[PDB]
Amino acid sequence: ADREDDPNFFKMVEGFFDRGASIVEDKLVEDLKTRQTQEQKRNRVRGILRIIKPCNHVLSLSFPIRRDDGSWEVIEGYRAQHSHQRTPCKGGIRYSTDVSVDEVKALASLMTYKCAVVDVPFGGAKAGVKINPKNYTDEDLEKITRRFTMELAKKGFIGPGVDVPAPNMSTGEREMSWIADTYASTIGHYDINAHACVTGKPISQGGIHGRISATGRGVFHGIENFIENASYMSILGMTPGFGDKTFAVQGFGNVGLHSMRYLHRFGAKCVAVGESDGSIWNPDGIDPKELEDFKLQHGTILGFPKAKIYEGSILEVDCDILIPAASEKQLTKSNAPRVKAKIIAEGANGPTTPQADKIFLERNIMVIPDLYLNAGGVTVSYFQILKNLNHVSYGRLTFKYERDSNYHLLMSVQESLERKFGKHGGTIPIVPTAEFQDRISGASEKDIVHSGLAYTMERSARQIMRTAMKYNLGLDLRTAAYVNAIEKVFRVYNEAGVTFT
Amino acid sequence: ADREDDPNFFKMVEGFFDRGASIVEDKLVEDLKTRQTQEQKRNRVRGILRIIKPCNHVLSLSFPIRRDDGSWEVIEGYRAQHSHQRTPCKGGIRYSTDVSVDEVKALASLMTYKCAVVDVPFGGAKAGVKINPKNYTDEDLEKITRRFTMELAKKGFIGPGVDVPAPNMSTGEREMSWIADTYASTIGHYDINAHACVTGKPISQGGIHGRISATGRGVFHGIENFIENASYMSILGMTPGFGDKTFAVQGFGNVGLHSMRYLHRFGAKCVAVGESDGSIWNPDGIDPKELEDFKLQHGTILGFPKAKIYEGSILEVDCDILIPAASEKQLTKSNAPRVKAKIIAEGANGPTTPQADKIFLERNIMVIPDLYLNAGGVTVSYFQILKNLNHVSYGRLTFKYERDSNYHLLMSVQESLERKFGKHGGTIPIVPTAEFQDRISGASEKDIVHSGLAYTMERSARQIMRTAMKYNLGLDLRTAAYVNAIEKVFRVYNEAGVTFT
Amino acid sequence: AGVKINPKNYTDEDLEKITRRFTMELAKKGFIGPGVDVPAPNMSTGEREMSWIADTYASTIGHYDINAHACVTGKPISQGGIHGRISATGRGVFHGIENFIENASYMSILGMTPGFGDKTFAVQG
Amino acid sequence: ADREDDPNFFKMVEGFFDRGASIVEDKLVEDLKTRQTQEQKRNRVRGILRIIKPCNHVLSLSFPIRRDDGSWEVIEGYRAQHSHQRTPCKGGIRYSTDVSVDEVKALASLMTYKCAVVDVPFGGAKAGVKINPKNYTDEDLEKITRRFTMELAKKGFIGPGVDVPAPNMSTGEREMSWIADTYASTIGHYDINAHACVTGKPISQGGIHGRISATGRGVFHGIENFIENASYMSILGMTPGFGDKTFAVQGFGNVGLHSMRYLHRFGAKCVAVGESDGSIWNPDGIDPKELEDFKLQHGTILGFPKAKIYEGSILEVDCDILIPAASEKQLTKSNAPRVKAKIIAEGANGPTTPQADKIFLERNIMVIPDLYLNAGGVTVSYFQILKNLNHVSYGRLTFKYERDSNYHLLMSVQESLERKFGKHGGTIPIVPTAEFQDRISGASEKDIVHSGLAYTMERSARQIMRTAMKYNLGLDLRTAAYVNAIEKVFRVYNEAGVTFT
Ligand SMILES: NC(=O)c1ccc[n+]([C@@H]2O[C@H](COP(=O)([O-])OP(=O)(O)OC[C@H]3O[C@@H](n4cnc5c(N)ncnc54)[C@H](O)[C@@H]3O)[C@@H](O)[C@H]2O)c1
Ligand SMILES: NC(=O)c1ccc[n+]([C@@H]2O[C@H](COP(=O)([O-])OP(=O)(O)OC[C@H]3O[C@@H](n4cnc5c(N)ncnc54)[C@H](O)[C@@H]3O)[C@@H](O)[C@H]2O)c1
Ligand SMILES: NC(=O)c1ccc[n+]([C@@H]2O[C@H](COP(=O)([O-])OP(=O)(O)OC[C@H]3O[C@@H](n4cnc5c(N)ncnc54)[C@H](O)[C@@H]3O)[C@@H](O)[C@H]2O)c1
Ligand SMILES: NC(=O)c1ccc[n+]([C@@H]2O[C@H](COP(=O)([O-])OP(=O)(O)OC[C@H]3O[C@@H](n4cnc5c(N)ncnc54)[C@H](O)[C@@H]3O)[C@@H](O)[C@H]2O)c1
Ligand SMILES: NC(=O)c1ccc[n+]([C@@H]2O[C@H](COP(=O)([O-])OP(=O)(O)OC[C@H]3O[C@@H](n4cnc5c(N)ncnc54)[C@H](O)[C@@H]3O)[C@@H](O)[C@H]2O)c1
Ligand SMILES: NC(=O)c1ccc[n+]([C@@H]2O[C@H](COP(=O)([O-])OP(=O)(O)OC[C@H]3O[C@@H](n4cnc5c(N)ncnc54)[C@H](O)[C@@H]3O)[C@@H](O)[C@H]2O)c1
Ligand SMILES: O=C(O)CCC(=O)C(=O)O
Ligand SMILES: O=C(O)CCC(=O)C(=O)O
Ligand SMILES: O=C(O)CCC(=O)C(=O)O
Numbered sequence A, B, D: 001a002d003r004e005d006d007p008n009f010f011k012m013v014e015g016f017f018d019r020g021a022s023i024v025e026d027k028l029v030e031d032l033k034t035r036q037t038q039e040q041k042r043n044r045v046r047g048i049l050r051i052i053k054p055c056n057h058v059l060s061l062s063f064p065i066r067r068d069d070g071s072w073e074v075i076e077g078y079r080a081q082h083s084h085q086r087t088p089c090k091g092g093i094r095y096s097t098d099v100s101v102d103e104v105k106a107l108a109s110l111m112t113y114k115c116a117v118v119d120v121p122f123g124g125a126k127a128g129v130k131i132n133p134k135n136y137t138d139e140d141l142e143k144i145t146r147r148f149t150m151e152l153a154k155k156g157f158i159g160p161g162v163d164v165p166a167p168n169m170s171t172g173e174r175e176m177s178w179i180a181d182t183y184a185s186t187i188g189h190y191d192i193n194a195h196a197c198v199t200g201k202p203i204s205q206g207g208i209h210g211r212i213s214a215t216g217r218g219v220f221h222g223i224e225n226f227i228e229n230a231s232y233m234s235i236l237g238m239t240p241g242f243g244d245k246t247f248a249v250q251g252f253g254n255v256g257l258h259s260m261r262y263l264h265r266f267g268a269k270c271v272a273v274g275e276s277d278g279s280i281w282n283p284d285g286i287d288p289k290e291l292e293d294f295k296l297q298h299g300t301i302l303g304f305p306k307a308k309i310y311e312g313s314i315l316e317v318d319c320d321i322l323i324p325a326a327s328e329k330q331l332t333k334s335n336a337p338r339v340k341a342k343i344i345a346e347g348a349n350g351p352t353t354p355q356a357d358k359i360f361l362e363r364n365i366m367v368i369p370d371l372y373l374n375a376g377g378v379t380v381s382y383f384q385i386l387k388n389l390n391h392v393s394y395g396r397l398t399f400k401y402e403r404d405s406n407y408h409l410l411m412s413v414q415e416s417l418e419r420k421f422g423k424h425g426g427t428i429p430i431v432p433t434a435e436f437q438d439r440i441s442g443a444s445e446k447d448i449v450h451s452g453l454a455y456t457m458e459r460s461a462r463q464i465m466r467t468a469m470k471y472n473l474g475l476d477l478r479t480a481a482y483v484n485a486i487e488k489v490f491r492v493y494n495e496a497g498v499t500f501t
Numbered sequence C: 001a002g003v004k005i006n007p008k009n010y011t012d013e014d015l016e017k018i019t020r021r022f023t024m025e026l027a028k029k030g031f032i033g034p035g036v037d038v039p040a041p042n043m044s045t046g047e048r049e050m051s052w053i054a055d056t057y058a059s060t061i062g063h064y065d066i067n068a069h070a071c072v073t074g075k076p077i078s079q080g081g082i083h084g085r086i087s088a089t090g091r092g093v094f095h096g097i098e099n100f101i102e103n104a105s106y107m108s109i110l111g112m113t114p115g116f117g118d119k120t121f122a123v124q125g
Helices: A009-031 A040-052 A101-117 A138-153 A173-184 A211-227 A230-235 A254-265 A288-298 A354-362 A376-390 A399-420 A445-470 A477-494 B009-031 B040-052 B101-117 B138-153 B173-184 B211-227 B230-235 B254-265 B288-298 B354-362 B376-390 B399-420 B445-470 B477-494 C012-027 C047-058 C085-101 C104-109 D009-031 D040-052 D101-117 D138-153 D173-184 D211-227 D230-235 D254-265 D288-298 D354-362 D376-390 D399-420 D445-470 D477-494
Strands: A057-066 A072-081 A089-095 A125-129 A163-167 A246-250 A269-274 A321-324 A343-345 A366-368 B057-066 B072-081 B089-095 B125-129 B163-167 B246-250 B269-274 B321-324 B343-345 B366-368 D057-066 D072-081 D089-095 D125-129 D163-167 D246-250 D269-274 D321-324 D343-345 D366-368
Touching: A009 A040, A009 A101, A009 A354, A009 A477, A040 A477, A040 B057, A040 B072, A057 A101, A057 A138, A072 A089, A072 A101, A072 A138, A072 A163, A072 B040, A089 A101, A089 A173, A089 A376, A101 A125, A101 A376, A101 A445, A101 A477, A125 A138, A125 A163, A138 A173, A163 A173, A163 A376, A211 A230, A211 A254, A211 A321, A211 A343, A211 A366, A211 A376, A211 A445, A246 A254, A254 A269, A254 A288, A254 A321, A354 A366, A366 A477, A376 A445, A399 D399, A399 D445, A445 A477, B009 B040, B009 B101, B009 B354, B009 B477, B040 B477, B057 B101, B057 B138, B072 B089, B072 B101, B072 B138, B072 B163, B089 B101, B089 B173, B089 B376, B101 B125, B101 B376, B101 B445, B101 B477, B125 B138, B125 B163, B138 B173, B163 B173, B163 B376, B211 B230, B211 B254, B211 B321, B211 B343, B211 B366, B211 B376, B211 B445, B246 B254, B254 B269, B254 B288, B254 B321, B354 B366, B366 B477, B376 B445, B445 B477, C012 C047, C085 C104, D009 D040, D009 D101, D009 D354, D009 D477, D040 D477, D057 D101, D057 D138, D072 D089, D072 D101, D072 D138, D072 D163, D089 D101, D089 D173, D089 D376, D101 D125, D101 D376, D101 D445, D101 D477, D125 D138, D125 D163, D138 D173, D163 D173, D163 D376, D211 D230, D211 D254, D211 D321, D211 D343, D211 D366, D211 D376, D211 D445, D246 D254, D254 D269, D254 D288, D254 D321, D354 D366, D366 D477, D376 D445, D445 D477
Parallel strands: A089 A125, A089 A163, A246 A269, A246 A321, A321 A343, A343 A366, B089 B125, B089 B163, B246 B269, B246 B321, B321 B343, B343 B366, D089 D125, D089 D163, D246 D269, D246 D321, D321 D343, D343 D366
Antiparallel strands: A057 A072, A057 B057, A072 A125, B057 B072, B072 B125, D057 D072, D072 D125
8 A cells, every 4th residue: 555656566567568668679670670661660669569568368257156154155366368479378376355457467467578588488377366365264265266277267267278377375286286186177187288287286296396495496596696796796885695695585475485495595694574464583583494383383473482573664674685575566665765675586576666666776776576586486387387298207217227328438438547557557446426426317307497497597697687788777687677578578479470460 | 427426337237236136135035945044045045146246257358450551559358258047148249449347247247137137048248349440440340350259269258159249339240240250260160050159140141130120129119018008107197109209319329220210110209319429309300211311321410401400418308208329327317307208218238327217216207227128139139049040041941831731721711611601602712811911921030030029028028017016116117127137047046056166 | 877875865065066076077978968968867866956967067068068058957947947847757657547548448458447537546656 | 716715806906905005094194284183184094095996987888890790799898997196097908708897997996006106197097898809800809999999989988188098918019009090090180199099009100119028027127126135035035036046927928928038038947837728837947939939820838849738727836936927816815825936926917816915925925016016017108108298219319419429528538638648648548338339329219118117117116115114014015015006196186185076
């Protein structure tokens, strides 16, 4: 409720898109070489960006579920499929009373540009049931999410080839298991890819190792790629490395917890934690496990044995990095001017407002765009659909060959050496180091996920920097990202003849 | 723009639904006999009506079309499917810049209760592209409506068995022809019912005689059933019959024109005609043909050689019957108190506001609900889907048998008589009257449509009256109608176990 | 078709779950649908379960079937039933008898008279 | 016909399932952490195992085929799909007059637990036509199996994504070719995976190298993993290795022949061979090729030039290992007490009865469960579906890159060494050994199959041992296996919310 400065979530993201469209329009028109034209090229380049902004299809459901206590109850649901330029649209299903067609619509677009930035071949999409998961019983929720899967199913809003839902606020591997089981037992009964209809599902259901921690681990990698490039941190008037840094995370949920888990592991210090109901603050730092354990057995962090119940704005906390990890539009124009963190790690979707951005730019703050920072979720989710398609857990088929061959390879150099340096050399044993030893069988699903996310995160980062440079965005990483997210999403459209009218 | 009194179209209709739900709730709970209960019956009866109110599925599209002059253009579209209690949902596709998700949502619900009232087995639905048909070329429009049909097609929002679109504001047999041709040449290529995906289509494309005039002819029948029942017209402090009456129609479009065509034919006098751009008023009456011809060659009625360009509120015109035949919510609280017409023939969807209704009740005015009055469109549209399913034009198979047999039947009584009254009787020729002669081959498609609409319109009327009586609604025909539209739409839900949770 | 339960042991809701779930199972193997197999009532099943069956079939597979509701018969009137289905088998049993109880020839071997009017009967179940 | 002790095949396997369910129930309830409960956890854990035991869907066909000599003939067929917890159910199609709904039902369940044990992601299933392949002409058989494929096809009992048939008794790559050709020329005409509907098909039809020998090679690997772990063989009061061992195989068919082929290759001695019609016994050992060749040109082993027609119980033969490789329930309570073999290699499905098991336990005999031992067929069959999905024969895309790169790698260490040890070193050629040489291009389809089966077989073995230990099963390998096959098959169910009621 930011009074002046509580913008329409879809138009906001739409706007962010627009600023990048500015820094690029020309070059789009430029590279564009379509013969007969002048700046007709421009208008073309101009129509396309207009065609990109809006959501293609948005479905609004309303369906009954019989509450445990007899009572019938109509429920609201939405699934916006922003783009198809890449087909399987992807996006999480948010369970919160705060959902709405515009909220989901934006959350959807953020998915399409997000995937662009990180090179994950999906269009964007987003779902949202309008309930408060804490009011329904665990069984009400099954009925609701199983029924919601059926409804989306019969209108083209879910399935391995059209739209692939995943987790978000108040949804996790549980509902992803429910969704997959009613889809695969219903429509996909004959689909060889029946279970790739959703991602973020449990391991026993076809999940992949590292999806729970994925977004956090990505938030972590997002930061590192930037917290270790002096140049940037110098403008930050800070040092390189988490090791001497400090951070405070808003929301202690999926991305929140794990983001804190990873930063902590790399020496960063978590001085504060914000939650729907309250804050915490131990300057001597809080321990991600301890805190999580407490949260686990208290359904709350409030009253953590080792930190005073802080009362203020968790966002206003004094710490090098603030990582918003909950609802959108939190760092608004009315609090931006005092967030006092050098780095804003946008782990949540759309946490900072255009106005707040402006301030951050002025206050000279680096806000790593959610549009790149939380791309760690779709990447690993991509490695899950990929997995599902492959029908094999990584390694199972090669491990042995991989190992045997590897030993032979070494043994080649060995004998090679012995044969020359004969009997004096006598025996020159060639042995894999500790490290290589634990790699002698090749990568496993866990290796691929981690190593993979790491490569994609680091790549999209440099991708963002070059752009930030070429255009002097400086610490305006976002619109540099949009610039990217715009020419990829543009190259597809343009080269497709746009539309069959 | 009715300042105080320009209500949310969906909540308005929702409300109308609610008042009827009041006059019935009890009896619903009553008839309801489900064993174990008390007034649990009530809560049940209460959940169901809650489950009925909202739209099941609503799809919001946005798609590009390349305007004739190169320019790319994103377009807005919606298709709300209010209910499925009866499967093929039905509703027209409105082309107006005034469309919106809520407008369509309401227009959709009005379809489901409307069909209930007139016993046409379809759930309600409504479509709306957001354009002003006068700005696009005739070809822009094909591209738009053919492209819109494709989009709705791939999400379950059109097809002989799910949703069957039809005409509405700024759409007619032309676009209905376009829709059917891209549906049947695309998805329905193998559908034996490929062409029943839409109704209101041209005759050469599988239309039915009387669909263009259907809604008007229905508006006419709606009035007669009420303008000839002294009792009502007595409260009206009026006489029985159109013959000595006078009326003024708003909007000179599909329902408008033809409504005027039919009333005129039955002696009623059309003193005024309102149009988007202007009014007309000849007290000596205007001629529906003359006026139409002029409109045809002038794309306007303005400046009709035989009537002075009236300037006022066509709705405020002094005439026995006012027939709103255009955009919704026109007789608002701010003009209701001076409409000066004894009968309000709601040919348009939702023209009178709850407040205006109240006034009309007070001023003691009879507003025949659109919820029954314009049901003439869905009825004949129902006779078109029915036709399409049958794959035969009415009569073709029987006409001859029908005729031959008929002559034999008469010739039986003939000989029967002669045989007794022998030679004196000598020859007693039995011959069909003029009338029977033109019925000797049995009904034709035109007979069925007309005779059929006539029967359904007159039936739903008496159905409305009995209800108006049983509950003392008096001249509050609407909520009597909702009372009907509610227990049919209720009987289905309840007896279906409601929902698979 | 035959489910192996005793309807008097399950609650009225157990039964919905069972028959709705049974309709889904038959559905995905070709054992129900307007064009392959059309279930109807029998012992311990009636217009109620026929309503349940039709609603999970038509809300599931037959969502696009123009004949989604002909997947089952014997369903309630509000669901697409027909007048006389409940009484149908009985009325047929009646007509079956008459056609035979009024043809002396047969009833003569029966050493009986023509007509129900002077007859007497006992029904099991 | 084991008089007392000829159990209902489905209940038998059901029982085996039950004993494992005992040794685990607790821990299932244990690990299970679902909040609100007590030993409610138990009941839950108890319902699930009840839900697992029975077959989901079982289809019973009867269809005509016109016997070559005019005569019409009705045929019996069954296809039981035991589970879906993993979708593509898998199982062979048995052609024998001994098929029956219960036989197939059991054979089906054995498939689901079998695949569990060896980590092959398929539910279990089994098919059975009721004919004696020796009575019909080779053409009768095509008609029958092509017609059977069509029937199963139209009821959901065959297809790349629901159920994938494979060989079994009296069916082989021939019928698997027939099945695939009528499926892919019929329903799967547009299926990109049309040919993965069946596995075990010929190479020219999309087979994989090693499927014929797969089950045998697996039986072999199954034994080795156990015949070389002193500890076990010590209780066996035997030595480690096939090299000094001796065995007798029942049934000289697919698994039979090849099992003998592989054991023989590793020094084991095949003293006897049993066949539907007769036994053989050369103590000096029989040669798998010789015997096969003779069988090939004599449609029988009876009268093998190098072994006396033995008359007794091939199962009662004096030999270290007895490998049942034919019909089920052969080592019953009435012959178990005198089988005189230290190791029972269950190559056939369900050859030993619970009673016989008990005896074997008492006599202190190790029966390696069919539930793990013949898993070599589904594994390679899994590598065939996998292959079919991939649409590429292993290696084709990488061989060259693989090789080139490999040589460069070596040449790196080479120059690396030379550069230091300069001109004295002068030339230190680094050359792949013989072994590495024949691996320089990376694995081929044959490498993957072999190396792959080897890894999976050896893994599931250790998996069985740890379990046999943790619970003191000792030489009761089976119920240790079920313990495994039960918590995997349990983890899926439980975490799926079980069922949408
Ligand atoms: N889970 C993913 O894979 C993923 C991927 C990308 C982006 N995200 C974003 O992360 C955010 C939340 O993470 P999640 O949804 O994965 O976890 P979650 O559903 O566990 O997150 C909710 C957590 O935030 C707390 N919370 C909610 N609103 C709060 C508020 N206003 N103040 C303080 N605490 C609040 C809740 O109590 C809870 O601990 C959202 O912005 C979502 O879009 C998640
Ligand atoms: N049909 C399903 O419900 C389902 C679920 C998951 C995975 N899959 C398939 O498997 C592939 C990746 O998963 P994965 O299982 O190959 O990899 P994985 O080895 O990463 O799977 C891990 C778990 O599954 C177990 N497992 C393997 N096969 C099993 C079986 N038949 N029964 C019970 N447990 C079994 C392993 O022992 C382990 O506990 C995907 O390509 C997909 O087609 C199917
Ligand atoms: N066509 C049908 O079958 C059908 C069926 C039921 C209800 N209706 C209702 O009838 C109404 C319009 O009839 P139509 O849509 O069939 O015909 P149409 O699309 O020809 O109607 C539009 C006509 O009204 C005029 N018009 C529009 N807005 C006006 C305004 N504010 N003032 C004066 N004139 C105006 C236009 O200039 C035009 O002559 C709508 O309320 C629609 O829901 C139509
Ligand atoms: N497939 C299509 O495009 C199409 C179009 C319209 C009607 N139909 C079918 O026909 C049925 C009702 O229409 P109908 O034509 O039977 O009734 P109808 O007799 O009311 O049709 C009137 C017009 O079609 C003409 N006509 C009939 N058959 C024709 C043909 N083969 N070619 C050209 N003109 C022909 C008549 O001479 C007349 O001008 C529906 O059941 C539907 O399946 C199909
Ligand atoms: N083929 C596979 O991939 C596979 C996989 C797993 C388990 N199995 C099991 O192996 C067994 C048979 O192997 P197969 O079916 O692959 O080969 P097959 O169909 O060639 O086997 C039949 C062989 O056993 C002989 N035979 C049949 N009944 C006999 C009896 N009672 N006594 C002596 N000889 C008899 C036949 O004459 C023939 O030589 C079955 O138990 C089957 O379930 C096979
Ligand atoms: N559509 C079919 O009937 C069919 C059959 C087998 C394999 N496949 C496809 O091929 C894949 C694995 O089989 P593969 O052939 O790639 O591997 P492969 O190289 O192991 O196949 C071996 C045999 O096919 C031959 N071969 C390859 N392409 C051929 C062609 N176009 N025509 C005739 N012979 C050809 C090789 O020379 C060799 O004799 C699968 O992914 C599947 O989609 C299709
Ligand atoms: O792609 C996924 O699996 C989840 C995407 C999502 O909601 C996010 O990245 O916020
Ligand atoms: O049912 C039809 O064909 C048209 C319905 C419609 O729009 C109306 O009755 O206003
Ligand atoms: O999975 C396969 O291909 C065959 C399975 C089978 O019948 C067995 O393992 O006995």
